[PDB]
Design an enzyme around this catalytic site. Structure first.
Site, PDB file in Angstrom:
ATOM      1  N   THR B   1      62.159  -6.764  70.656  1.00  0.00           N
ATOM      2  CA  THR B   1      60.976  -5.261  71.087  1.00  0.00           C
ATOM      3  C   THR B   1      62.311  -4.489  71.679  1.00  0.00           C
ATOM      4  O   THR B   1      62.457  -5.543  72.901  1.00  0.00           O
ATOM      5  CB  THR B   1      60.014  -5.188  70.873  1.00  0.00           C
ATOM      6  N   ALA B  49      51.458  -5.752  69.067  1.00  0.00           N
ATOM      7  CA  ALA B  49      51.841  -4.977  68.178  1.00  0.00           C
ATOM      8  C   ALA B  49      50.301  -3.801  67.590  1.00  0.00           C
ATOM      9  O   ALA B  49      49.934  -2.725  67.847  1.00  0.00           O
ATOM     10  CB  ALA B  49      52.159  -5.098  66.272  1.00  0.00           C
TER      11      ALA B  49
END
Ligand SMILES: [Mg+2]
Ligand SMILES: [Mg+2]
Lengths: 233, 212, 240, 222, 244, 204, 235, 231, 195
Positions: B1, B49
C-alpha cells in the site's frame, strides 16, 4: 476447551432405497485402554430417528439427555405429539447442529462427531453429519473418525451417487455396513468386535439390532507369515 | 500500500495506490483506499482494510449527526478526534489503522490529520502511509512547494504513487486522485499504473534504468 | 432503586411538579439579563433580610461555566449548584473532544436537556431553578443571552428577567429596551440593568450584583462602589 | 488446545455481466485429505434476487448465510416488504462480518445479483467485512489458479490487437451469459485438474431480472 | 403495591416548597442552640446541650461539636445520629482531598460537598432528608477564617456570626446588635456565651449544659490550633466572662 | 524487571534502652541511573514511625494511605495510634492486596505512649509480621544489613550509643549495595523527644 | 395514588389521554402533503416581545429527506428528535440507503409507550413527520404519545387543530401545487392564531425530492404572506 | 371501584377490573373477522380512519410465511405481541428447522399476556388478536384475549359490533367450513360476515383489508384495488 | 516519544522537548510540541507510548481546567503534581496502564518559587532542580551536575540547556530533530521560538 477422556470410535451410515442404516461399536475407550465394553452409542429418538455419536462419552451422555428432554418438551401441550407434530429427524439434527455450533463458539465444545439418521414424514431419507466444530454435511454415505477413511470407500462402491440410492436394497446396504464394521475391527486399534446396528425404513419402521458381532474373519494366513524379512523359521 | 496527502495553496491533494495483497498473492488491483466519508471529508486506507472502511464509514454517520445537532459543518479537528478517540478505546484489541483525515473548512483552511490505531493523532502538511511510503516521501519532499498549482499538485501526488508502485512490490494497480476544496472534494480519476508508467517514462525522461 | 413517577400529567394536561418548580423560581431572588451591542450584563438581586453575611465567601449568584460563558439563576440555590457543576464538566468535555469551547446556545441546550430529563425520569423531581445563560461564542463578537426553566424549554432573549417580581422588571424592560438600538456601550447596558432592578430591589446598596461579560473571555464583576455610582446617577436624573 | 476453525476447502466464482450475474461454486466439501460430500450446496438463493456464498470454514459459512437470509426476512418486516437492494445487502453483510471482528467468520464471502439500474453486480468480502463491488472474483482454494485466467480472458489483460504490437489494447467487449458460463466451466475444469480440493460437481446460480436459475455440471471425482 | 405507603419525600408543595425540608427545619428549631462567631484572630463555636441530667458523663460526651480535620470543625443542630453519618463522610472527603492534592482541603470545598449530599436527598432517592443543620468553623490559607452553615435543603451560606437550632431569631438579633468587624476571639467568646445565656430556655446557663470550642492562630507561629473545651475549662470561661 | 529492586534503598530499625532507632538511605534510582538523593523512606504518624523500602511509587502511595487511615483513626478514637495497633493496620492493609500486592518492605518503629515500651516490627510485601526484639532490616541490601546488625548489635544500648550502631550498620551495608546510599537519615526516638540526623557518606 | 400505566373503565390509558390535553394547549402546527412536496408550518407563539423569535425551533430536520414539526410540551420532543436522527443515520449506515418515512415514524412511535414504574411518563408533544422516499413518495405522518401514527394528506395539531382540520377538510385536493399548499398553511395558521400572522411569529418549511428538507427564510415567508393577503383581497 | 387501581388486585367477587378494562378497549376497536375451511384460513378486517385526510389504520400483520394475525384495540400492543410471535416463529425455524404450530403460537401469546396480569407495575395488553395459519395439521384460526385466554375456532369476530358477524358465522358454519380449494369463495364468506357488523358506513376500496393463508398459499395481505374484486 | 528535559533556575522553570515523531521507519513530523498548559503558571511535558501520551496529557489538562473554573483558583504546582502522580499510580495497576512519563514545570505564585516535578509512568514523583526521562539523563546529568547553580538566571539556564542538547545531538544515535523550549515564570508560560 477440554480434552476427550472416555471416547467412542467410528459411527458409519448409508442411505438405501427405502431408508437409512447406521452402525457403531459398543466400546468406550480410555486412551489405549479398552475400558468399557457395553456402551450403546446409537440413541433412538422416537420411531423415526437414530442419532449415532462418536467422541467424548460424557458429552454423548449429555446429548443423550438433551434428546430425551426434547421428546418430553415436544409432548407438552401437543395433542399431535405422536402424529403430525412428532419430532422429525430434520428437527432433531438442526437442534443438535445449533447446540454444537453454539458450544464451539463459546470455546467449550461438545467433543463429538454426530450422525443423525432417520426417515421424514414424507418418507424421505435423512442422513446428516455434525461435529464439535458445528460443521455439517450430507452425503449418501457418512462416517466419523476411522470410518471416514475406511468405511466410506467401501460404502461408496455401493452408493457412489444419489442415483444409486433407489437401486440399493436394505439387504445389500446392511451387508456393506456389516463388512465395513469388520474392516474397522481389523484396522482400527480403538474398535471392538461387538456393535449395534439400526435400520430406519419408511415401511417397516425402526429396527434396532443390539449385541451384533464381527464374524467371518480371515486370520488363517497369519500362520505362514514369519519374521520381518529374512527369517525362514 | 501507498497512500499520501498534502496541504497546499489550492487545498489538499490525496493520492493512493490500488493494490491489495495476501502474502505474495495479489488479491485485488482495484481497491479503493480513499474513503469518501462525506462530500467534504476524505480518509485514506492503510493497515487493516475492514478497520479503515468500517470506522471511516461509521465516521460519516457521526459527522452527519454532529451537523444535524449543531447546524454547522464539523471541523477537521473534531472530525479526526472522533476517530482517534474511538480507536483509542480499542487500543490493544488489534485494530490496524494508518489514515489521513483530510478536509477544508472556513475556520481551519485545508487540514490533514494523520490518525493511527495506536491512538496517534498528528496535524501536518505532508503525510505518507503504507509499505511504499518511503518512495512517495522522496518525490514529495524534493518537489513540494506551498505555491503549487492544482494541476502540478495533482501530478506530484500521481507521480509519487507511481514511484512507490514501481519499487514497492505491495503497491501498484492504479492511482486514485482527489483534490479537496472548501466546497468539497473533487475526484480526478483512476489511472492504471501500467499505462501511467510508460506515459511518464517517455514524457518525463525518468526511469532510464527500465527498458521501454 | 427508587423509581416513583413524581412528575406526571393531570386530567387538565398539566405536570404539577414542573409547574410547582416554577413557583420555587417565583420565590427566588430576581435575576435579570440585558445584552447590549458588544456586551451582556447579568443583574442579580440579593435580599437584605440576611445581614451579618460574609460576602467574600457566600456563593455568588452569577457563576462562570467557562472563561467565556456565565450562568445566573432564580430559585432553589442547592439545585442550581448541580446544574452549574454538570455544565462546567460538559464545557471541559466539549473542549476535550471538539477542540473548541462550547457555544452559548450549546451550553444552554445541554443544561435545558438536563432539566427536561428530570421532568420525565423516575424517582426524581424537577429542578426548582430557571437560569439565565450569557456569553460570547468562540471567535465571535455577537452577544448571546438565553433562558432555561424547569420544564426544559429554552430560548434566546434580547433582555429577560426571572424570579420574584420578574413581571414588574419585564414590564420595565419591554418599554425601555429598543431592539433597533440596544445599549451601545457597557455603561448604557449596566445602567439599564441597574434601573430595571431598582423597580423591584428596595435599597440600591448591597442588594444589587452586576456582572459584565464581553467578547474573548472578558468577564468582570462590578464592586459595591461601582454599582452605587449607577444607583446615585439614576435617582438624581429621576428627581426631575 | 481446541481449534475453533477448520478448512472445508471449496472454490467459488462470481462474475458480473451487463444485465446478469453468475455465482458459481464447486460442490465438494473436504477436511484434510478426505471428502465429506461430493454434493454439498455452497451457493444459496437468499431471496430478493440475491445469491450468496461464504467459502472457507463451512460452519461459519452456514452461520453467516443463515443470518443474512434472516436479515432479509426482518428487512421486509421492518420496512414494508421493501426489496433489499444488492448494495444494501452488501453493507448489511459488512456489519454482520465486522460484528465478529475479534472472533471472525473464517470465510471469504461473495454475493451476486443486479443493482438498482438492472446491471450485473458482484460484491466481494474479506473475513472481517471489508467489501467491494467487483466485475470478477474467484474465492477459496483455487482462487489463485482462476483469477489470472479471468484477468486474461474476461478483462483481456496483456492482450493487444495484432499488427499494432502493444500500442492498441484489445477492446473490452461485453460477454453474454453463455460466454461467461463457458469461462466459469473452463476455470473449474482447470482448477479441478491442478487442485486436489476442487472437483466432483459445479453448481452455477445465474441471476437475471426474470429471477434466479440454476445449472449443474459434473467435475472429475479424483 | 408499595406506592400506597410512599410519603414522597422529594416533592414540591403547591407553593413551591419541599415539605420534608421545611419539616426538618421545624425539627431543628427544637434542637439546642449552636452559635458560631468569626473574629480576625480566630473563630468561636458555642453550643447548648439539651436538657441534660446530673448522671450524664459530660467529659466523655459529644453531641454538638465535632472535628472534621485539624483545621475544620462543626457545630451540630438536630438529629445527632444523622449528623454523625454526614460528619464521617466529610472526614473521608477531607482525607481524599489531602491524599489527592497533598494539601489540606479548603473549607468551602468541604462545605459544598456535604451540602451537595444533603441536596441529593431532597431531589432523588425517595428517602427522608437529614434532619441536621451544621455550623462550619474552619481555616485555610486562601480565605483564612471562615464560618458557614448548611441545612437539610443542601443550601449553604457564609457568615461573620450565625446561630442554628432553637431561638435563632432572638439569637441572631443579639449577635447583629453587639458584633463588630474588628472583634477579637476573647470578645467573641464573651458574645457567644452572653447570647446563649439570654436565648436559653433553661433557668440558668451552666458549664454542664454547654459545649465550647475555638479555632485560633493562637498556636505557636504560622499554624492553626483547634481547642475543644473541657468541662472545667467551660466552667472557668463562664466565671471569667461573669455569667456564673 | 523485579519491582522490589528497580528503585533500590534500605531501611533498618533497632531497639535500645527506653528508645528505638529507625534509619534509611536517601537514594531513588531507575536501576543503574541515580535519580534522587533526597528520597526519604521514613515517615511518621504521631509518634509511630514507618520506614518503607521497595517500589518508590508504592512507598509514596502507602505513606499517603497510612496518613489517611491514621488521621481518621485519631478523629474517631480521640487519640494517636500506637505502634502495636499500627503494625496490625499495616499488616491488614497489605494483605487486602494479597493477589496484587504493593512491592514494599515496611518497617514500623516507635515507643508505646502508655507503657513506654520500645517497639519495632517488619513486614514482607504481603503483610506477614516480623516482630523482632533486636532489629528489623529491609531493602536491596537486607543481607548486608543482617550481617552488620547481627555482629554490631547488643541489647539495651543508650540512645547516643544506639545511634552509632544503627548508623554504622546502615552506612557499611549501603556501601556494599549499588542501589543504596546517596545519603542517609537516622531517627533516634525517645518517649517524648525525637532527634533526626543526616549522615555524611560516600556519594557513589 | 394510582399506577402510571393504569387503564380507565372506558379502556384508555389515563396518562396518554392526559398528555393529549397538554398537546391541545400547544401552539398550532399544520402539515399539507402534495405530489410536488410536503409543507410544514408552525405558530411560534412568543410569550414576550423581548424573546428573539428566530430561536423558537418548532420545525426540525431529521434527515435530508425527512422533516418534523411539533406541538405541545416542546422540550419533550428533543429526545424524540435525537432518536429519529439516530435511527435515520444508523439505517443509512447499516443499509447504504435512505430510510422510509413510515419506518422512521414507527421507530419514533416505539418510544411513546415505553413509560411506567424506562421514562416516568408519556411524551407531552405530538409530531407531524413529513418526508419523501422512492417507494411511497411524499408522505405526512402524525405521531402521538399513544404510540399510534396516522398518515395524512393534511393535518393540524395544537390549540387550533379542530378548527384548522375542518378548514383543511374543505381546502385539500389531490392536485394541489406546492405554492398552493404554502399559502393554504399560512391562511389556516392566520385563522387560528391569537396574534396577527407575520414572518416572525410563524414559520414555514417543506420537503421536496430534489432539494430535500428546507426551513423557509423569514424573507421568503414574508413574500408568501404578502401574496396571500392580495389573493384574499382579490375576491 | 376500589379494586381497579392496578392489575394485581382481585375484586371481592374474584374479578380483575384492569383486565376487564383492557377487554373494553377491544370492543371500542374496529371490527375484524376470522374464518377458515380445511384448506385455507382468512382474515377480513374493517380498517378505521381518523378523518377523510387520514389513512386507514392497518389491522393485519404477517408473522411468518405460514402465519399472521389481525388486531382490534391498542395497535402498539399488537405490534409488541406480533413482534414476539415473529421471533418465536423465527426461533422455531432457525433452531429446529420447523414451522411453529399455530396452537403452540397461541400458547405462547397466552403466557406472555398472563405475566402482565399477575405482576405489579405492568398493565394488561389492550388488544385482541385473530391469528390464522396453515401448519402440519392444516388450517387454523385462533382468538386471543389479553386476559390470556386463547381459543381455537372455525370462525369468529372481535371489535365493535362484532356480534353481528359472529352470529352470521354461527349460521354459516356448515357452509364455509366446506369451502376447500377455493380461496375467493372463502373470502366472499368473510366479506359477507363482516358486512353484518357495519352500520352507516360500507366497504370501500381503502376501507377493506383481507389476508389469506393456505395449503399452497403463503400468508399474503390484500389492500387497495386488490380487494375491489370482493366489494 | 524521545527526549524531554527540565531545569529549575532562580525565577523560572525551563522545559525542553524534542520535535521528532517517528513511527517505525519514517520520521512523520519534525515540529511536534510535546507539552500541555495545565494552568496559566503550570506546564507539563510528556514522553512515552504513542496515543497514551497525548490522551493522558489532555485528560490532566481538562481536569485542572475544570478545577480552575469550579474554584476560580489556580492549583499550586505541588497540588497539580500530586494529582498527576495519583492518576499514574492508579494507572499502573489498571487493565491497560498509561505508558507516559511527564515533567511538570510550574511557578508557585503564593511562594514566588519555580518548581520542577519529575513523574514516571509508575507514579514515581520527585521534585528536582533539573530532570529528564528515558535515556536523556544519561547524556545530560553529568553536565547538569557540573554546571548547575540554584541562583542561575533564565539566560544561563538556556545556555546550559544548549550544552545538554549539543551533547545529545553528538552522542545519541537517534535524530530527535531539535527541541522546543518553553519557560514558566511569574508572568506565565512562553515559548523560546529560536533554539
Ligand atoms: Mg480434483
Ligand atoms: Mg555510583
Amino acid at each position: 476447551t477440554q480434552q476427550p477422556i472416555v471416547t467412542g470410535t467410528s459411527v458409519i451410515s448409508m442411505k438405501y432405497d427405502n431408508g437409512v442404516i447406521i452402525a457403531a461399536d459398543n466400546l468406550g475407550s480410555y486412551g489405549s485402554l479398552l475400558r468399557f465394553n457395553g456402551v450403546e452409542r446409537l440413541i433412538p429418538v422416537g420411531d423415526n430417528t437414530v442419532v449415532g455419536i462418536s467422541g467424548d462419552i460424557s458429552d454423548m451422555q449429555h446429548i443423550e439427555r438433551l434428546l430425551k428432554d426434547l421428546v418430553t418438551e415436544n409432548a407438552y401441550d401437543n395433542p399431535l405429539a405422536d402424529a403430525e407434530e412428532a419430532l422429525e429427524p430434520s428437527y432433531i439434527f438442526e437442534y443438535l447442529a445449533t447446540v454444537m455450533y453454539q458450544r464451539r463458539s463459546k470455546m467449550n465444545p461438545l467433543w463429538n462427531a454426530i450422525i443423525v439418521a432417520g426417515v421424514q414424514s414424507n418418507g424421505d431419507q435423512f442422513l446428516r453429519y455434525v461435529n464439535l466444530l458445528g460443521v455439517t454435511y450430507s452425503s449418501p454415505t457418512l462416517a466419523t473418525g476411522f470410518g471416514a477413511h475406511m468405511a466410506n470407500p467401501l460404502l461408496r462402491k455401493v452408493v457412489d451417487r444419489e442415483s444409486d440410492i433407489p437401486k440399493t436394497t436394505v439387504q445389500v446396504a446392511e451387508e456393506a455396513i456389516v463388512n465395513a464394521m469388520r474392516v474397522l475391527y481389523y484396522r482400527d486399534a480403538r474398535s471392538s468386535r461387538n456393535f449395534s446396528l439400526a435400520i430406519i425404513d419408511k415401511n417397516t419402521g425402526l429396527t434396532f439390532k443390539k449385541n451384533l458381532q464381527v464374524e467371518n474373519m480371515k486370520w488363517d494366513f497369519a500362520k505362514d507369515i514369519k519374521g520381518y524379512g529374512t527369517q525362514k523359521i | 500500500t501507498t497512500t499520501l496527502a498534502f496541504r497546499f495553496q489550492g487545498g489538499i491533494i490525496v493520492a493512493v495506490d490500488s493494490r491489495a495483497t495476501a502474502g505474495n498473492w495479489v488479491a485485488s488491483q482495484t481497491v479503493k483506499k480513499v474513503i469518501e466519508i462525506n462530500p467534504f471529508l476524505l480518509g485514506t486506507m492503510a493497515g487493516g482494510a475492514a478497520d479503515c472502511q468500517f470506522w471511516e464509514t461509521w465516521l460519516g454517520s457521526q459527522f452527519r449527526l454532529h451537523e444535524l445537532r449543531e447546524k454547522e459543518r464539523i471541523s477537521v479537528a473534531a472530525a479526526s478526534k472522533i476517530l482517534s478517540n474511538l480507536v483509542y478505546q480499542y487500543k490493544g484489541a488489534g485494530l490496524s489503522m494508518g489514515t489521513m483525515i483530510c478536509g477544508y473548512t472556513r475556520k481551519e483552511g485545508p487540514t490533514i490529520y494523520y490518525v493511527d490505531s495506536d491512538g496517534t493523532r498528528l496535524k501536518g502538511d505532508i503525510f505518507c502511509v503504507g509499505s511504499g511510503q518511503t518512495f512517495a516521501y522522496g518525490v514529495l519532499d524534493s518537489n513540494y512547494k506551498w505555491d503549487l498549482s492544482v494541476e502540478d499538485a495533482l501530478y506530484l501526488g500521481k507521480r509519487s504513487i507511481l514511484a512507490a508502485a514501481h519499487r514497492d512490490a505491495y503497491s501498484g494497480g492504479s492511482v486514485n486522485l482527489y483534490h479537496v476544496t472548501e466546497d468539497g472534494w473533487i475526484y480526478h480519476g483512476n489511472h492504471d499504473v501500467g499505462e501511467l508508467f510508460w506515459k511518464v517514462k517517455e514524457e518525463e525522461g525518468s526511469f532510464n534504468n527500465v527498458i521501454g | 432503586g427508587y423509581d416513583r413517577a413524581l412528575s406526571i400529567f393531570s386530567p387538565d394536561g398539566h405536570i404539577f411538579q414542573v409547574e410547582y418548580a416554577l413557583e420555587a423560581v417565583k420565590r427566588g431572588t430576581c435575576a435579570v439579563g440585558v445584552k447590549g451591542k458588544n456586551c451582556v450584563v447579568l443583574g442579580c438581586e440579593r435580599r437584605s433580610t440576611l445581614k451579618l453575611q460574609d460576602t467574600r465567601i457566600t456563593p455568588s449568584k452569577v457563576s462562570k461555566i467557562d472563561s467565556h460563558v456565565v450562568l445566573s439563576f432564580s430559585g432553589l440555590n442547592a439545585d442550581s449548584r448541580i446544574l452549574i457543576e454538570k455544565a462546567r464538566v460538559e464545557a471541559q468535555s466539549h473542549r476535550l473532544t471538539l477542540e473548541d469551547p462550547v457555544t452559548v446556545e450549546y451550553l444552554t441546550r445541554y443544561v435545558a436537556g438536563v432539566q427536561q430529563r428530570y421532568t420525565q425520569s423516575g424517582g426524581v423531581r424537577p429542578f426548582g431553578v430557571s437560569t439565565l445563560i450569557a456569553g460570547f461564542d468562540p471567535r465571535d463578537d455577537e452577544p448571546k443571552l438565553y433562558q432555561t426553566e424547569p420544564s426544559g424549554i429554552y430560548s434566546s432573549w434580547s433582555a429577560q428577567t426571572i424570579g420574584r417580581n420578574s413581571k414588574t422588571v419585564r414590564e420595565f424592560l419591554e418599554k425601555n429596551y429598543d431592539r433597533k438600538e440596544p445599549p451601545a456601550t457597557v455603561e448604557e447596558c449596566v445602567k439599564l440593568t441597574v434601573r430595571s432592578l431598582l423597580e423591584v430591589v428596595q435599597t440600591g446598596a448591597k442588594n444589587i450584583e452586576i456582572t459584565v461579560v464581553k467578547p474573548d473571555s472578558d468577564i468582570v464583576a462590578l464592586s459595591s462602589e461601582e454599582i452605587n455610582q449607577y444607583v446615585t446617577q439614576i435617582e438624581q436624573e429621576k428627581q426631575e | 488446545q481446541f481449534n475453533p476453525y477448520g478448512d472445508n476447502g471449496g472454490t467459488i466464482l462470481g462474475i458480473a455481466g451487463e444485465d446478469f450475474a453468475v455465482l458459481a461454486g464447486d460442490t465438494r466439501n473436504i477436511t484434510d485429505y478426505s471428502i465429506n460430500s461430493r454434493y454439498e450446496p455452497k451457493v444459496f438463493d437468499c431471496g430478493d434476487n440475491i445469491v450468496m456464498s461464504a467459502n472457507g470454514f463451512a460452519a461459519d459459512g452456514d452461520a453467516l448465510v443463515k443470518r443474512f437470509k434472516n436479515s432479509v426476512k426482518w428487512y421486509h418486516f421492518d420496512h414494508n416488504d421493501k426489496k433489499l437492494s444488492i448494495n444494501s445487502a452488501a453493507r448489511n453483510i459488512q456489519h454482520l462480518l465486522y460484528g465478529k471482528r475479534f472472533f471472525p467468520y473464517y470465510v471469504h464471502t461473495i454475493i451476486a445479483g443486479l443493482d438498482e439500474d438492472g446491471k450485473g453486480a458482484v460484491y466481494s468480502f474479506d473475513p472481517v467485512g471489508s467489501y467491494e463491488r467487483e466485475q470478477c472474483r474467484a474465492g477459496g482454494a483455487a482462487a489463485s489458479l482462476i483469477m489470472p485466467f479471468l484477468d486474461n480472458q474476461v478483462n483481456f489483460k496483456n492482450q493487444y490487437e495484432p499488427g499494432t504490437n502493444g500500442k492498441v489494447k484489445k477492446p473490452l467487449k461485453y460477454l453474454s451469459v453463455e460466454e461467461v458460463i463457458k469461462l466459469v466451466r473452463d476455470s473449474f475444469t482447470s482448477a479441478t485438474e491442478r487442485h486436489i480440493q476442487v472437483g466432483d460437481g459445479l453448481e452455477i446460480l445465474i441471476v437475471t431480472k426474470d429471477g434466479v436459475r440454476k445449472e449443474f455440471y459434473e467435475l472429475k471425482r479424483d | 403495591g408499595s406506592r400506597r405507603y410512599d410519603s414522597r419525600t422529594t416533592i414540591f408543595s403547591p407553593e413551591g416548597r419541599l415539605y420534608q425540608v421545611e419539616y426538618a427545619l421545624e425539627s431543628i428549631s427544637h434542637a439546642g442552640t449552636a452559635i458560631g462567631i468569626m473574629a480576625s484572630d480566630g473563630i468561636v463555636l458555642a453550643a447548648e446541650r439539651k436538657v441534660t441530667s446530673t448522671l450524664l458523663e459530660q467529659d466523655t460526651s459529644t453531641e454538638k461539636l465535632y472535628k472534621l480535620n485539624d483545621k475544620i470543625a462543626v457545630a451540630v443542630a438536630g438529629l445527632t445520629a444523622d449528623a454523625e453519618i454526614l460528619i464521617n463522610t466529610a472526614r473521608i472527603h477531607a482525607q481524599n482531598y489531602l491524599k489527592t492534592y497533598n494539601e489540606d482541603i479548603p473549607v468551602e470545598i468541604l462545605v459544598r460537598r456535604l451540602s451537595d449530599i444533603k441536596q441529593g436527598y431532597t431531589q432523588h432517592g425517595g428517602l427522608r432528608p437529614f434532619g441536621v443543620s451544621f455550623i462550619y468553623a474552619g481555616y485555610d490559607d486562601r480565605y483564612g477564617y471562615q464560618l458557614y452553615t448548611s441545612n437539610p435543603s443542601g443550601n449553604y451560606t457564609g457568615w461573620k456570626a450565625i446561630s442554628v437550632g432553637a431561638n435563632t431569631s432572638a439569637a441572631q438579633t443579639l449577635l447583629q446588635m453587639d458584633y463588630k468587624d474588628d472583634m477579637k476571639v476573647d470578645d467573641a467568646i464573651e458574645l457567644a456565651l452572653k447570647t446563649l445565656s439570654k436565648t436559653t430556655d433553661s433557668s440558668a446557663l451552666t458549664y454542664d449544659r454547654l459545649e465550647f470550642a475555638t479555632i485560633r492562630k493562637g498556636a505557636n507561629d504560622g499554624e492553626v490550633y483547634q481547642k475543644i473545651f473541657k468541662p472545667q475549662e467551660i466552667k472557668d470561661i463562664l466565671v471569667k466572662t461573669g455569667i456564673t | 524487571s523485579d519491582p522490589s529492586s528497580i528503585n533500590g534503598g534500605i531501611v533498618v530499625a533497632m531497639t535500645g534502652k527506653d528508645c528505638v532507632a529507625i534509619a534509611c538511605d536517601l537514594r531513588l534510582g531507575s536501576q543503574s541511573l541515580g535519580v534522587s538523593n533526597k528520597f526519604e523512606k521514613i515517615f511518621h504518624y504521631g509518634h509511630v514511625f514507618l520506614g518503607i523500602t521497595g517500589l518508590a511509587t508504592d512507598v509514596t502511595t502507602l505513606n499517603e494511605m497510612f496518613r489517611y487511615k491514621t488521621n481518621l483513626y485519631k478523629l474517631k478514637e480521640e487519640r494517636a495510634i500506637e505502634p502495636e495497633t499500627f503494625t496490625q493496620l499495616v499488616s491488614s492493609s497489605l494483605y487486602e492486596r494479597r493477589f496484587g500486592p504493593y512491592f514494599v518492605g515496611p518497617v514500623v518503629a516507635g515507643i508505646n505512649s502508655k507503657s513506654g515500651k520500645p517497639f519495632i516490627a517488619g513486614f514482607d510485601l504481603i503483610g506477614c509480621i516480623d516482630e523482632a526484639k533486636d532489629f528489623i532490616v529491609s531493602g536491596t541490601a537486607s543481607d548486608q544489613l543482617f550481617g552488620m546488625c547481627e555482629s554490631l548489635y547488643e541489647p539495651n544500648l543508650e540512645p547516643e550509643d544506639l545511634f552509632e550502631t544503627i548508623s554504622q550498620a546502615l552506612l557499611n551495608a549501603a556501601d556494599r549495595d549499588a542501589l543504596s546510599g546517596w545519603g542517609a537519615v537516622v531517627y533516634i526516638i525517645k518517649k517524648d523527644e525525637v532527634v533526626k540526623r543526616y549522615l555524611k557518606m560516600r556519594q557513589d | 395514588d394510582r399506577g402510571v400505566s393504569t387503564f380507565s373503565p372506558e379502556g384508555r390509558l389515563f396518562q396518554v389521554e392526559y398528555s393529549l390535553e397538554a398537546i391541545k394547549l400547544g401552539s398550532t402546527a399544520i402539515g399539507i402533503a402534495t405530489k410536488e412536496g410536503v409543507v410544514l408550518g408552525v405558530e411560534k407563539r412568543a410569550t414576550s416581545p423581548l424573546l428573539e423569535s428566530d430561536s423558537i425551533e418548532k420545525i426540525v430536520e431529521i434527515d435530508r429527506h425527512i422533516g418534523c414539526a411539533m406541538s405541545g410540551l416542546t422540550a419533550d420532543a428533543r429526545s424524540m428528535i435525537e432518536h429519529a436522527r439516530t435511527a435515520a443515520v444508523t439505517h443509512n449506515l447499516y443499509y447504504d440507503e435512505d430510510i422510509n418515512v413510515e419506518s422512521l415514524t414507527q421507530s419514533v412511535c416505539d418510544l411513546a409507550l415505553r413509560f411506567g414504574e424506562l421514562m416516568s411518563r408519556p411524551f407531552g408533544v405530538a409530531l407531524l413527520i413529513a418526508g419523501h422516499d422512492a417507494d411511497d413518495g411524499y408522505q405526512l405522518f402524525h405521531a402521538e404519545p399513544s404510540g399510534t401514527f396516522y398518515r395524512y394528506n393534511a393535518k393540524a395539531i395544537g390549540s387550533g387543530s379542530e378548527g384548522a382540520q375542518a378548514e383543511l377538510l374543505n381546502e385539500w385536493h389531490s392536485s394541489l401545487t406546492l405554492k398552493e399548499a404554502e399559502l393554504l398553511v399560512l391562511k389556516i395558521l392566520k385563522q387560528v392564531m391569537e396574534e396577527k400572522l407575520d414572518e416572525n411569529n410563524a414559520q414555514l418549511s417543506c420537503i421536496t425530492k430534489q432539494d430535500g428538507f428546507k426551513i423557509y427564510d423569514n424573507e421568503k415567508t414574508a413574500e408568501l404572506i404578502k401574496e396571500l393577503k392580495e389573493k384574499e383581497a382579490a375576491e | 371501584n376500589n379494586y381497579d387501581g392496578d392489575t394485581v388486585t382481585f375484586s371481592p367477587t374474584g374479578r380483575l377490573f384492569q383486565v376487564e378494562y383492557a377487554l373494553e378497549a377491544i370492543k371500542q376497536g374496529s371490527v375484524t373477522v376470522g374464518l377458515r375451511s380445511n384448506t385455507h384460513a382468512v382474515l377480513v378486517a374493517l380498517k378505521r380512519n381518523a378523518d377523510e385526510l387520514s389513512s386507514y389504520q392497518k389491522k393485519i400483520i404477517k408473522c411468518d410465511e405460514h402465519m399472521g394475525l389481525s388486531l382490534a384495540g391498542l395497535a402498539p400492543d399488537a405490534r409488541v405481541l406480533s413482534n414476539y410471535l415473529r421471533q418465536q416463529c423465527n426461533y422455531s425455524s432457525l433452531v429446529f428447522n420447523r414451522k411453529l404450530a399455530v396452537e403452540r403460537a397461541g400458547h405462547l401469546l397466552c403466557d406472555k399476556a398472563q405475566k402482565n396480569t399477575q405482576s405489579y407495575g405492568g398493565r394488561p395488553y389492550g388488544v385482541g388478536l385473530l391469528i390464522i395459519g396453515y401448519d402440519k395439521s392444516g388450517a387454523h384460526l385462533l382468538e386471543f384475549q389479553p386476559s390470556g385466554n386463547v381459543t381455537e375456532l372455525y370462525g369468529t369476530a372481535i371489535g365493535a359490533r362484532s356480534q353481528g358477524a359472529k352470529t352470521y358465522l354461527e349460521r354459516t358454519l356448515d357452509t364455509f367450513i366446506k369451502i376447500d380449494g377455493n380461496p375467493d369463495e372463502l373470502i366472499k364468506a368473510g366479506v359477507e360476515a363482516i358486512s353484518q357488523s357495519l352500520r352507516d358506513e360500507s366497504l370501500t376500496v381503502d376501507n377493506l383489508s383481507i389476508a389469506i393463508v393456505g395449503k399452497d398459499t403463503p400468508f399474503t395481505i390484500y389492500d387497495g384495488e386488490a380487494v375491489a374484486k370482493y366489494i | 516519544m524521545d527526549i524531554i528535559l527540565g531545569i529549575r533556575v532562580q525565577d523560572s522553570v525551563i522545559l525542553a522537548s524534542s520535535k521528532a515523531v517517528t513511527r517505525g521507519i519514517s520520521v512523520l513530523k519534525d515540529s511536534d510540541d510535546k507539552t500541555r498548559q495545565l494552568s496559566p503558571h503550570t506546564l507539563m511535558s510528556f514522553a512515552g507510548e504513542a496515543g497514551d501520551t497525548v490522551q493522558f496529557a489532555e485528560y490532566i489538562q481538562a481536569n485542572i481546567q475544570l478545577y480552575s473554573i469550579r474554584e476560580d483558583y489556580e492549583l499550586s504546582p505541588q497540588a497539580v503534581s500530586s494529582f498527576v502522580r495519583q492518576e499514574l499510580a492508579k494507572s499502573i495497576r489498571s487493565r491497560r496502564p498509561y505508558q507516559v512519563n511527564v515533567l511538570i514545570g510550574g511557578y508557585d505564585k503564593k511562594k514566588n518559587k519555580p518548581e520542577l516535578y519529575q513523574i514516571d509512568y509508575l507514579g514515581t514523583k520527585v521534585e528536582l532542580p533539573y530532570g529528564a526521562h528515558g535515556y536523556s539523563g544519561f547524556y545530560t546529568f553529568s553536565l547538569l551536575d557540573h554546571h548547575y547553580r540554584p541562583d542561575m538566571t533564565t539566560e544561563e539556564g538556556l545556555d546550559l540547556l544548549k550544552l545538554c542538547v549539543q551533547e545529545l545531538e553528538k552522542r545519541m544515535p537517534m535524530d530527535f530533530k531539535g527541541v522546543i523550549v518553553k519557560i514558566v515564570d511569574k508572568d506565565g508560560i512562553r515559548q523560546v521560538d529560536d533554539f
